[PDB]
Symmetry: D3
């Protein structure tokens, strides 16, 4: 990284300035999962980027997933699953495991990585300070939508308390569990919870780290990768995409329709993807705006 | 509770007033473990008492343990232990389990119980916002003090950040894990961590919930239960007590010598023990002051 | 008070918690007169209860009367009265006496009693900082309503200045005198002034200390004492009650219709009546709500 | 006042500017008694001057007396006095009268006069919010100093609470009564209480309204009126002056020695004496500084 | 100024009080030019009056002109002018000169004069902190309105930033230059800029220092000088006045129609004209109100 | 700038993070002159870098020179100079010119350039709000140090007011003129004024833009350019350097000895020199630390 002439290091730094202005003082929600979360080099870069944002006076909020880690813990504990469609039923037992893996293991790693740069990160769920609630969701399994246990969608968000915590300079690292109106804690899909947090906080950008270059119109035609797309066009192509992309795309729609200026699907396999998507025009992600 | 004449309900309420004045605006650290934590009726009463304090403008801080729950999880996961003396060696594997049980299971239950009364509780470890650090401790096993893995004593405490969180009206529920100066997370004995938090925050009282009526000079002589005792006298009798009481008593000494006006050993088997110790002179606990 | 088992002292304390939550941070206006004001034991209990409220983060405002003390001072000064109906005409001379007795004697005693518990109470009239104004009221004497001198109803209240003084932690002790729009000070009936203060400050409760168990439908039928009643029903029975109860009931109507959630007529002959009405369900008072 | 050329109205206004700068944002304690308090034209001018100060961002504090009004009330009430030396013994009965006359009559008139210009004045004694305490004083009667009842000197002053009330824009009008360390209210000489308030608040000036042109070295030699004098010189001539001037001069000494930059003895028989002493060099008063 | 009896110095000071109340805490914009700006004695008096206002808790804002000083500098620099009608075309060269004379010479003198009394004045243009913008204005020259270069009218004003600077206790001294929406700096007529600042800041008064006794209906009939006039009447006589008075009168109309309670045309040849217009009823100026 | 692989744009951005942390919330004083100030491309880059810093929550303070522009204006005005040694005597006439060129021309250009990115810059001298004072300096001309008119060194700095203006988010652009203790304005060398501002504000870095690669031990030996040097070593080589470097080096010594962690001499001929010196390790400047 040293053979690079310094007059060019200068220019890439200077070229960040219009995005520094656009995001100064603003909320950016980042959904973090996939290989950016399981590879050690990408993890440390991700944590360093959160520290970066925060040392620019930008206000990151991290929502994390952890599907595979829950599955591994359930097998270690010998807890046999029930499955309707392709969905595990989350019994009270499974939720306790989900909660202790998400909040007590996965969240901790990111909190510690970020905090290597300063006292920034703090972990939380909807349970803490009543920051958000859940409502039980059913799923559609080849016809009759059905019940699959303590699985929810975000209900209400304590917008005021959340922004107080951010204005105080903290980086909330959110584990997606929250109580319903009766105090019963549900597990919430992390992609959609990111969308709901972004909308409630008036975020400027939703960033969705995913394990793909970006959105493909006609996968796997290479000459079909899009750079930008509107929600209306993104509605009419939703029924066509691979299973893995549906939650990430529904999140971007639910956010951008909800007033978030842009949602982005970026590649988490790229080192410092966040820095390149926010401060560079050479990003590989795809940007969703309204229309 | 209705056959009680109302002129007497009045008097017990009025008799709380001098302790309301003494504790208004003040920090009270409560170590919470034992049967007050495992029995459902005592749990709900404990949570309701934390809500009480907080609706009197008193500032509770809860430090919780969970030794037995860690042990059960380790057996469920089939993780065989190593033991020096009577101490389990906490390998990196054991700490990950300890942390996920303490923060992701035991802390969650108390947060949810308290939050049934309002948005008060928030869970945290030393990892969050760098609130406190640990330093590795060795243990003395019948002679040569020795190493037993990632087990620590509290090092430094971010007093300012902690009191900000309390002045904001929150009830921190602390899980005793914290990073050392190198970012490596240790498990801290909860009794001694309570003592260190109390001293750092300038608490007015340390409350230590324990499964005994109180301190016995000469157990099991009944006519030996003390009501109050000074630290100097409490130093010279320390080498004489049952194994279970040593950490609770060392905590009270380390706190009261450190400037906390009084530490109390109260019985957690009593419903609403906190209310009776703080707002009543008919408490069964034993109070430690300096001298 | 010591032969009472401690597990029962606990329960009556715990049973206060839902009213602590309901009133935390809220304004409670208390009209204080009668035998709770002239008996020494009831006085000290009343003052101690105001200190209690204030050490729970509740915000009491005390409005006091003093009819009989004015009369005694007038006789001591040999000032002969004029009477239309049953009403003394308050000449400029009588008002100067009323003001100096109410503010300079009766208010002082309560300020001093309360302040024995801390720097809480501060005395005031509408004259101070222009906190409220009066408008001259006429009275109805068996037909033609007529003039009886410098006697008023509360006009406007400086809501902002009043709540600043309360948020500062003070317990205003109000003597009901205020200037009209021309600077001429009037004496205001204390019961109705309490109602107007409660409505202006957005109080949660109006407490009216009176020398009776509570409201009787058909006095003196014992089996006619009510526990709760709505304003509409309380309008249609108003023309039926003893002379002494009319101002206390008109106050509760004017307050509850004005948005105060509940007004209460409680017995000031009961030691710590305030504590039992606020923090106990075994109260003897009668509660007025809208409907 | 109209035949005066306007170029000269201009100059006297401009000539106030260096005292506006000196006193902007500062505390001025004014002892107010005598004929400035009993003549209606001088009263209204005094009140208007307090409003003036306050509309210049200056912070007046008024301490008032009222000796003669107490005496008249005692005679109206037929309360016979006891006298040691020339001093009335203030029994509990006399104090109740003193307090109700000072706070409930004399203070009220000034509060109302000032408040004709805005919501500025608020009345208070040491009893309110524990603003100051008294300590019982004995007197020297031709030899053996002796006890004369509930008469005190100011003990401690709640400097913080007092300046909060002033920074809030209020003009405290102080009646000199305060409780001792046991809650027993004493009457304090107003001249000396003014001196103690001035010293406690870090006032810039003490103003002492008195019924004389100013200090005379050798009364009644006309060519003996002084314009300025230091405390050391003012100590050595104290044993020589008329009885009426001793309390006013002891006040100025106790204040200026206590750090108040200057104390002034001005003539309260002069309309707007305060304005002329503060904003004009043509004052008739006498100024005391240290040395 | 000493042969004046002191009882009369008192009365003129006391007679200022109702204007102190009216303007306490309020914004007063002062247009300053003409002989009050070029004569040394009038300059120092003007600066002293700004200090006066500020030491009364009044908030002056000074807008200054400087037409003749620009002309002299242009001749010193040998820059030949172009003239359409009677108007100099302000080329880029002329504006650089105008800006450096207005901000770098004329503004500096007033800043320094005022600051002799304290740290009050601070100089600024629309360029600083984007405090206001300009829009290019054309002029009407005996028919076809035409372009005369970089000359503007005030466009938008950063009301919030301006009042922050004033609430901080500063006296802004404004040089009328500001950028247009494209960053190109224009010179703004000072009289009309004063009117726009007054309206944007919600000033209580606009003061326009001019070199005349006041407005004459039928100049030069002496018996035609007016003391007060409404905007409607001031519209219909505008087409009749001398060239020099049109900008001063258009300013007063644009301000008073814009909600400023009164605009005043006062004589800047009078020492301390500001003090006499604000704090005296013997002013020679003419007051404009709406109607 | 597009043929650069994006994984490398990422790394140079990520490599800025440790200097973002070091300077977040801190003061950086930048002396700005020379060719970075006269070339249009370097000007716009400089202004953009100030906007950059400010959108990272860093607090730049710009001190500017302008020697050559003063000289040109003096010749345009035909003002003949007097010279002792190589120094122009600054008469009152020369200072008025210096002040109007520095504040009214050179400062304006930078204010406008920076403000193209937002409302950040505000121009000021020591005259404004009494922000700093000067003391007359003499010079040493081949022996006898002598007087050269109204030329000064910075005396006192209003540290509090200056940091208020910066905490408010403003970028002060300072023109080095200030009054002495008698109100007489002096011109201050900009290099040394930068050093004094840096020391007074507790800056983290002093940046000195100069027209050279950096400090040469033995100019013009190329193999003599230093990267870092301590003050003690920088004292003993000071008597050896070219005339142009002495003020820049004396500034760095006076700053670093005064507690500023590092002063830097960087090349203003390099586009975005500020960005490369602060956020890159490939800088060409030379850093001065204490020792
Ligand atoms: N709200 C909230 C919080 C939950 N955990 C925390 C740790 C430090 C500061 C704040 C919070
Ligand atoms: N407002 C008001 C007050 C009237 N008297 C007082 C005494 C202490 C504090 C505040 C006030
Ligand atoms: N806004 C603004 C300012 C422009 N110059 C200033 C000098 C001192 C304080 C504030 C400002």
């Amino acid at each position: 990284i040293e053979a690079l002439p310094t007059h060019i290091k200068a220019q890439v730094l200077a070229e960040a300035l219009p995005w520094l202005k656009q995001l100064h003082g603003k909320v950016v929600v980042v959904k973090y999962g996939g290989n950016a979360m399981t590879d050690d080099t990408l993890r440390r870069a991700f944590a360093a980027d959160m520290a970066f944002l925060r040392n620019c006076g930008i206000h990151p909020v991290v929502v994390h997933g952890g599907g595979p880690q829950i599955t591994a813990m359930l097998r270690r504990l010998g807890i046999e699953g029930d499955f309707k469609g392709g969905f595990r039923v989350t019994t009270p037992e499974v939720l306790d495991v989900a909660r202790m893996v998400l909040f007590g293991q996965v969240g901790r790693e990111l909190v510690n990585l970020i905090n290597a740069h300063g006292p920034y990160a703090v972990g939380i769920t909807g349970e803490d300070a009543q920051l958000f609630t859940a409502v039980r969701r059913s799923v559609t399994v080849d016809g009759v939508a059905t019940d699959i246990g303590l699985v929810g969608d975000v209900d209400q968000v304590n917008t005021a308390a959340m922004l107080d915590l951010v204005a105080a300079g903290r980086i909330p690292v959110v584990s997606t569990l929250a109580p319903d109106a009766d105090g019963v804690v549900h597990n919430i899909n992390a992609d959609t919870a990111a969308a709901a947090v972004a909308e409630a906080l008036g975020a400027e950008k939703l960033l969705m780290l995913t394990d793909i270059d970006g959105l493909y119109t006609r996968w796997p035609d290479r000459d079909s990768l899009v750079s930008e797309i509107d929600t209306g066009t993104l509605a009419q192509l939703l029924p066509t995409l691979e299973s893995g992309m549906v939650p990430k795309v529904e999140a971007c729609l639910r956010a951008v329709i909800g007033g978030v200026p842009s949602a982005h699907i970026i590649d988490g396999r790229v080192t410092h993807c966040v820095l390149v998507e926010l401060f560079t025009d050479a990003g590989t992600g795809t940007k969703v705006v309204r229309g």
